[PDB]
C-alpha cells in the first residue's frame, strides 16, 4: 500500500536508480495514481525510455486502465515521444484500445497532424 505511492512519483520523475531499486523491494508494478495510471503511463509520455522498459521488465501491463480509459499506448501517442511508441507494439500494446470518449491510439496521429505517427500506426 505505502511503497507504491512513492514509486510513481519517480516513475514520472525518472529516478531510475530509485525505480530499479524499488521493484527490488517488490514494488506494485501495477500501481495507480489518483487517476488510474501505472508508472507506465507516466514513463510513456516523458522521454524516460530509460525506465519505460524497466516496468515491462518487472511485468507492468502493456495496456493498463487509465481512469479516463487511457492505456499508456495513448499516453505515449500523446507525446512526439516517438522512439518510446515503437517499443509498445514490440510486445503488443492494444492498437485499438478505446478511451471513455471513443478514442484510440491511431486517433491522435492527426489530432496533432503527426505524419510519422499515422505512418507507423498503419502497421501492426
Amino acid at each position: 500500500s505505502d511503497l507504491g505511492k512513492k514509486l510513481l512519483e519517480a516513475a514520472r520523475a525518472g529516478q531510475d536508480d530509485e525505480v530499479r531499486i524499488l521493484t527490488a523491494n517488490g514494488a506494485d508494478v501495477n500501481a495507480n495514481d489518483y487517476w488510474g495510471h501505472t508508472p507506465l503511463h507516466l514513463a510513456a509520455m516523458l522521454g524516460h525510455l530509460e525506465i519505460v522498459e524497466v516496468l515491462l521488465k518487472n511485468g507492468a501491463d502493456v495496456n493498463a486502465t487509465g481512469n479516463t480509459g487511457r492505456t499508456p499506448l495513448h499516453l505515449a501517442a500523446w507525446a512526439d515521444h516517438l522512439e518510446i511508441v515503437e517499443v509498445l507494439l514490440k510486445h503488443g500494446a492494444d492498437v485499438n484500445a478505446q478511451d471513455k470518449f471513443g478514442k484510440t491510439a491511431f486517433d491522435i496521429s492527426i489530432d496533432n497532424g503527426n505524419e510519422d505517427l499515422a505512418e507507423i500506426l498503419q502497421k501492426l
Partner: protein, 214 residues
C-alpha cells in the same frame, strides 16, 4: 539576424496557485512573421479531460516580430494532483507543429530562506533607497516574490526579481530589488519581502521585514 519561431510553456505562479487559488499556465510564441495568417494555439490535457476557455493575446513587436500568448486557467486540484497540459502550435507554412507540455514540477521539497536588506544612503539621490531581497535554498524553482509596505502589497512593476539560479547545492536562489522613496519610508519604515513557495509551511508563505533605518 536570425528568426526562429520558438514556444514557451509556463507553470502557474505559486501566488496564483496557492494564494489566489486561480492558477493559469501560459503558452508564449515568439518571433512570428506578422500577417502570415493566424497561428493556432491548442490546449489539451494528457488525461483527455476538458480544458477551460483560454485567452489569446497578440502584439506586434518593435523588432518586426509578432508575439502570441495563450493563457489557460487550470483547476487547482487538477494541477496539484499532476495533470499534464500541452500547448500545440499550428501554422500555415509550418513544417512540423510545435508542442510544449507542462505538469507540476516534482522532485525533493525545500523551503526558501528570505533575507531583506536596505541600502545605506548613497550621495546624490538621498531621497531614494533600494531594498533588496535574497531568497535562496528553495526547491523546486517555482517561486513568487512580492513586496509589501505597511502590510499591503505593492504593484509588481515596482520591483525586479531575478530568474531562479542554482545555488552551489541542490536549491535555487533569487534576488529582488525594490527602489523606494523618502515619502514612503518616512510615513512608515516598514517593508516586507514575501515569497510564495510550495515547500513553505504553512500556507506556502515566508516573508522578512526590512527597514531603511537600523
Amino acid at each position: 539576424n536570425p528568426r526562429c519561431v520558438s514556444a514557451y510553456l509556463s507553470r502557474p505562479s505559486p501566488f496564483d496557485l496557492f494564494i489566489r487559488k486561480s492558477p493559469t499556465i501560459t503558452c508564449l510564441v515568439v518571433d512570428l512573421a506578422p500577417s502570415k495568417g493566424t497561428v493556432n494555439l491548442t490546449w489539451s490535457r494528457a488525461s483527455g479531460k476538458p480544458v477551460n476557455h483560454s485567452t489569446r493575446k497578440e502584439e506586434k513587436q518593435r523588432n518586426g516580430t509578432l508575439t502570441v500568448t495563450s493563457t489557460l486557467p487550470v483547476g487547482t486540484r487538477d494541477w496539484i494532483e499532476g495533470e499534464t497540459y500541452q500547448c500545440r502550435v499550428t501554422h500555415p507554412h509550418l513544417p512540423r507543429a510545435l508542442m510544449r507540455s507542462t505538469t507540476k514540477t516534482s522532485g525533493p521539497r525545500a523551503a526558501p530562506e528570505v533575507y531583506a536588506f536596505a541600502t545605506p544612503e548613497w550621495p546624490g539621490s538621498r531621497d531614494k533607497r533600494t531594498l533588496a531581497c535574497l531568497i535562496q535554498n528553495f526547491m523546486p524553482e517555482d517561486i513568487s516574490v512580492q513586496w509589501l509596505h505597511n502590510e499591503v502589497q505593492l504593484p509588481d512593476a515596482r520591483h525586479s526579481t531575478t530568474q531562479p539560479r542554482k545555488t552551489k547545492g541542490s536549491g535555487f536562489f533569487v534576488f529582488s530589488r525594490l527602489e523606494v522613496t523618502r515619502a514612503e519610508w518616512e510615513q512608515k519604515d516598514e517593508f516586507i519581502c514575501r515569497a510564495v513557495h510550495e515547500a513553505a509551511s504553512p500556507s506556502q508563505t515566508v516573508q522578512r521585514a526590512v527597514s531603511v533605518n537600523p
